[PDB]
Amino acid sequence: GQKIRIRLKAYDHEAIDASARKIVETVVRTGASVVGPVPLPTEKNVYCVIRSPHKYKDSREHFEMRTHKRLIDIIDPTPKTVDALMRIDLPASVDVNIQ
Amino acid sequence: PRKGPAPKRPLVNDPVYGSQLVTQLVNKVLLKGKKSLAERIVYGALEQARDKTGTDPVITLKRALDNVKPALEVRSRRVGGATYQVPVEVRPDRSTTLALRWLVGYSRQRREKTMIERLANEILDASNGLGASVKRREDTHKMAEANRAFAH
Amino acid sequence: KKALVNKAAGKPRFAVRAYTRCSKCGRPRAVYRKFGLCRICLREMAHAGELPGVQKSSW
Amino acid sequence: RSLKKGPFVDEHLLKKVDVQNEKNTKQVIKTWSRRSTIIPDFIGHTFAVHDGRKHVPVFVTESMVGHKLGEFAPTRTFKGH
Amino acid sequence: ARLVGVDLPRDKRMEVALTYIFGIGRTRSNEILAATGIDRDLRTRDLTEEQLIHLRDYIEANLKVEGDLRREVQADIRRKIEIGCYQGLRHRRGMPVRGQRTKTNARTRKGPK
Amino acid sequence: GQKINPHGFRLGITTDWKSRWYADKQYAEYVKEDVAIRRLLSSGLERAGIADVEIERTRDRVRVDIHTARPGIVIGRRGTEADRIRADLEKLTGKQVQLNILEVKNPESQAQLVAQGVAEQLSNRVAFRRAMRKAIQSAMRQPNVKGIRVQCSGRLGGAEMSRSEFYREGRVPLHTLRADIDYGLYEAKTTFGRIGVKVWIYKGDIV
Amino acid sequence: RPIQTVGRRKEAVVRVRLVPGTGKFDLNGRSLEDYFPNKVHQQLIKAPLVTVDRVESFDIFAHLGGGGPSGQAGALRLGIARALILVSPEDRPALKKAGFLTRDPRATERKKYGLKKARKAPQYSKR
RNA sequence: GGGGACUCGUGAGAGACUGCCGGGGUCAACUCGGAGGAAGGUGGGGAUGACGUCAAGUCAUCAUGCCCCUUAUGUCCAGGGCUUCACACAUGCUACAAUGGCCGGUACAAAGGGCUGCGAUGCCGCGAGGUUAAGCGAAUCCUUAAAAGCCGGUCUCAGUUCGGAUCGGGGUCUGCAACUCGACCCCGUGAAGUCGGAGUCGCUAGUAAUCGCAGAUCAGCAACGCUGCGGUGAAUACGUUCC
RNA sequence: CCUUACCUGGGUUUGACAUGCACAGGACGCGUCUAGAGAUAGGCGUUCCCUUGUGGCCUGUGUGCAGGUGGUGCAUGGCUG
């Protein structure tokens, strides 16, 4: 009896963990039956670039866009708590989109 | 490096009749990492050696090996200015592996037929005291005994 | 430039004739798509902290 | 080895050549086009192609149909000593 | 074992034997040999006249070979020359045409010093 | 040349990201505005003492946290100037923008603000050494920090041959990452062009 | 409940829970002779010291996973060694002192900025 | 379906620190050997580049003082040229074949990317490609068959079945447009060249070597370059006299 | 092509853009002849705001200026080896 599939797009394991477990716990407090958190694989969009401004060197650096999606769970169809789920979300740092 | 040698990666017995010597042979003929292939090639040489000789290829390699192997190098290091080279005794391992290196090189030469066939040819010549690698041992000993000076 | 920038910003006439510029400092060559940057000011922002978790790796 | 769907000719010139085909061949016509493809309908029409420096006259035949105006508009200069 | 040119090898595959024709590679060899139903690996020693007849007929029915073929090539070349466009000009000067840089390379086309 | 901004290592250790949002396609739409937003806001607020600007993009509106030494300068006449720069920028950021002016409790702790201030002092045609002593003195006496390095580079008196020097006091162990070393800088105009300064503040280590 | 295979590899890890039986150690028709033409990894898996004949014979082949390169896939013998530990400890000093209770997780060195995969520094010129 | 046991994913901890035995050693520093253990004595690696130097470099990323132009040294535009060569130099791709070329068959990645998009499936086309179109804004859809490898066959040591450069013809793609000046494919020739002077770089453990893979950039051109992944997988190290 | 800063040649030349002082009142977009393009050129669409004064703002005039991949790293920052 599941209906609500959560999707969160974060880039910080700590932020998505600390904030998700609390807002989800409070959703449970409002009466929703919820599947436990699901740690999902991590994502990194890596970039490499020259340091030199005139760019007359082979000296390089290496960055990575550490996109973090984990602990993405599922909520049973409990409207009286779904309303609160819709009204209460997380900071933009964690992109909340729910099916 | 200088002082403090590093341990070599241990080698084991061949999956055929146990021999670290043959294992080493495979490692010496390994080209581009095709090591299973190299084993196939060597095993082919075992088959040709036994086909040609009627006995254990491995001990024919033992005879060939001792026949080729020298025990006295003709070069150590830099001495002075006009001084050429000073010969010096060689330890069993390096002497052995040099012999194997000669066998491989001359097997790589001789554009005749397959590697297994030309290996088998070199194996029997070497085991019979006919290999050019044995002639290299001859060169080792003749070119030696020259600047019998301070062996650095 | 200040005219060729406006020209570069000029949309019509064969968008392939249009040319993507950093738009922060101006840079024709070596411009990364998503950020849309010159890959220099990118470094400055990378150190500044203007990215959503784009950090240096340490593999 | 492209434009499988017919020869490509610059429209503004194509029309002019069409009128000339309607009446008769006319004097060497200047034009900044190094890409229009030669077709049999251009045979007999000598006209000039900007080659990066100036409009250079060139005459057309059937053998030239597989060639462009840029192939008929030399730009660089080789040796000279 | 002859159709037009020598075409006389020994201990060769048949398609490779066919590669001795100025104008026929492995592909065309397999096409005609497929048309005849004749194996790709078959030496000249095992050939008969009927086979040469089928091959001859299919060659005449499929393409041209040197003399005729090359003459067509020279006709195309001379066409390039008479056109005198950039392409013909590279052929006229012994220069490359297919987007090459003789400054450093194109030593096959230019020859060694 | 061979020195870095320590924040580049403390990006997810002790420092925060100023860009507070997640975006996939609209990301470019955000940052292409962040350029002009930051440039236009930074320009003209010299008296304010702009330490840092943090930005959250959410609810189709921008929220700007201004780490400034003097909120009253950004506010202006009870918000007249703040609204001048806020209300008018609403059509560019994307439907409404909200300022949140933050008061720096001790500007001396801000490497960027000390850098700016002392660089402006040099733009007031003062003795370099005396200016450095004053800036450093206040920036180590009034703060409770563990160290400072102030490095200046330029003509230093308007010399034809430029140069640089620094007055390290205490500790600035940059090669260690657990250190809390704040970093800022400022490039001040002078008669013969402009002179730069970088400031490192060995504030502490880690919680 | 069955003997949980646990062992490392070079890149594509191989392991499953197993049960004892005949000694028919294969998977999906991929016998040791089908999956390992060579006898090197065959025999390394055989663990001559402790084979299906030395000890309780086992059938459930360590599940492949990660594809399995023909070299590194021989690493499942680490799985066998751990399976033997799950059986008893008597050969744990035998296996550790032999050289089967180790790690072997080595992959490759990271490709460097100005170098190749294998740090193949280019042909420099000191003039 | 059902399950949470493993794997896998993944948060947080433990664990290796001379911890430890014996021995040595100015007892200390320090160290030999050893147990245990997954690793034993900065595991490996990365990021990190002291103070300072070379008037190194850049006004063309950016910034900017002075000087200069400012009916033009700015601005707009078709086209050209930056892609030229009698020569030279450098870094690189492939070969100079039998540890080999080719037909046919065949298990196996990892890491990434994709709703402007990925194009499954299926259709057509000799193929490159073209049509239709599922699912997918993604661990699930697609990208996705990895290739080297392996069973067998062919060819049997040749400038040849090596090598595919040059050049003609004929097809595909992008873009309004592919001549200057793009990429790919089919046919056709099958060039030079048979292991390299003098000289010299590279490389100590999953190394080196070697075969593939995928991104960034882009209308298109990245299967020689640059940045990441992964398969197979060696050898030598007596030693510091000399460069 | 653009990119391109170079150039053949063609046009503009307070300008492509920012923007000050006055006048002026649609701008702007569409479509179209011309022209290689730029632009020229015709016709459409048209000035909200109270161009009620102010506001918006092109265009035009004149001027502040704009602008410069012009030089100057042996003026210099910055950044890099």
From TrEMBL, chain A:
**SMART domains membership:** Ribosomal_S10
One GO CC term, this protein: ribosome
Keyword Ribonucleoprotein in the entry? The reply is yes
Report domain Small ribosomal subunit protein uS10 positions. 5-99
Q: Which SUPFAM superfamilies match?
A: Ribosomal protein S10
Task: Alphabetically list the UniProt keywords.
Answer: Ribonucleoprotein, Ribosomal protein
For the biological process aspect of GO, one term held by this record is: translation
| Pfam families reported in the protein's UniProt record | Ribosomal_S10
Tell me which domain of life the UniProt entry assigns to the organism this sequence originates from.
Bacteria
Q: Give the Gene Ontology MF terms in alphabetical order.
A: structural constituent of ribosome; tRNA binding
Q: Does the keyword Ribonucleoprotein apply?
A: yes
Function field: Involved in the binding of tRNA to the ribosomes.
Checking PANTHER family in the record gives: 30S RIBOSOMAL PROTEIN S10 FAMILY MEMBER
Give the record's subunit note: Part of the 30S ribosomal subunit.
Query: Into which family does the record put it?
Result: Belongs to the universal ribosomal protein uS10 family.
Give the protein's recorded name.
Small ribosomal subunit protein uS10
Q: What organism is the protein native to? A: Mycobacterium tuberculosis
Q: Which gene encodes it?
A: rpsJ
TrEMBL record, chain B:
Q: One of this protein's GO BP terms?
A: translation
Keyword terms, alphabetized: Ribonucleoprotein, Ribosomal protein, RNA-binding, rRNA-binding, tRNA-binding
Q: One MF term in GO for this entry?
A: structural constituent of ribosome
SUPFAM superfamilies, alphabetized: Ribosomal protein S7
What CDD domains does this protein map onto?
A: uS7_Bacteria
The record's Gene Ontology cellular component field reads: small ribosomal subunit
Small ribosomal subunit protein uS7 domain location is 1-148
Read off the PROSITE patterns from this record.
Answer: RIBOSOMAL_S7
Q: Which Pfam families match?
A: Ribosomal_S7
Subunit structure comment from the entry: Part of the 30S ribosomal subunit. Contacts proteins S9 and S11.
Which NCBIfam families does this entry report, sorted A to Z?
Answer: rpsG_bact
Which family does the entry's similarity section mention? Answer: Belongs to the universal ribosomal protein uS7 family.
HAMAP family recorded for this chain?
Ribosomal_uS7_B
Role, per record? One of the primary rRNA binding proteins, it binds directly to 16S rRNA where it nucleates assembly of the head domain of the 30S subunit. Is located at the subunit interface close to the decoding center, probably blocks exit of the E-site tRNA.
Report what the protein is called. Small ribosomal subunit protein uS7
Q: Which organism is it from?
A: Mycobacterium tuberculosis
GN (gene name)? rpsG
Automatic annotation (TrEMBL), chain D:
Which of UniProt's keywords are assigned here? Ribonucleoprotein, Ribosomal protein, RNA-binding, rRNA-binding
GO terms for biological process, alphabetical: ribosomal small subunit assembly; translation
> What is any one of the record's Gene Ontology cellular component terms?
small ribosomal subunit
Q: Which Gene3D superfamilies match?
A: 30s Ribosomal Protein S19, Chain A
Question: Can the keyword Metal-binding be found in this entry's annotation?
Answer: no
Going by the entry's taxonomy, the superkingdom of the source organism is recorded as Bacteria
Task: Check the record and name the Pfam families matching this protein.
Answer: Ribosomal_S19 (PF00203)
Q: One GO molecular-function annotation for this sequence? A: rRNA binding
Task: Give the similarity note.
Answer: Belongs to the universal ribosomal protein uS19 family.
Task performed by this protein: Protein S19 forms a complex with S13 that binds strongly to the 16S ribosomal RNA.
State the protein's name: Small ribosomal subunit protein uS19
Annotated source species: Mycobacterium tuberculosis
Q: What is the lineage of its organism?
A: Bacteria, Bacillati, Actinomycetota, Actinomycetes, Mycobacteriales
Automatic annotation (TrEMBL), chain F:
| Entry keyword annotation includes rRNA-binding | yes
Q: What are the transmembrane regions?
A: none
Going by the entry's taxonomy, the superkingdom of the source organism is recorded as Bacteria
Domain KH type-2: start-end pairs: 37-105
GO term, biological process aspect, one: translation
Which UniProt keywords are present, listed alphabetically?
Ribonucleoprotein, Ribosomal protein, RNA-binding, rRNA-binding
Q: Name one GO cellular component term.
A: cytosolic small ribosomal subunit
The molecular function terms of the Gene Ontology recorded here are: mRNA binding; rRNA binding; structural constituent of ribosome
Determine if Isomerase is one of this entry's keywords: no
Coiled coil ranges: none
* Quaternary structure and partners: Part of the 30S ribosomal subunit. Forms a tight complex with proteins S10 and S14.
Q: State the protein's purpose.
A: Binds the lower part of the 30S subunit head. Binds mRNA in the 70S ribosome, positioning it for translation.
* Family, per entry: Belongs to the universal ribosomal protein uS3 family.
Q: What is this protein called?
A: Small ribosomal subunit protein uS3
Organism in which the protein naturally occurs: Mycobacterium tuberculosis
Gene designation: rpsC
Entire-sequence positions represented here: 2 to 208 of 274
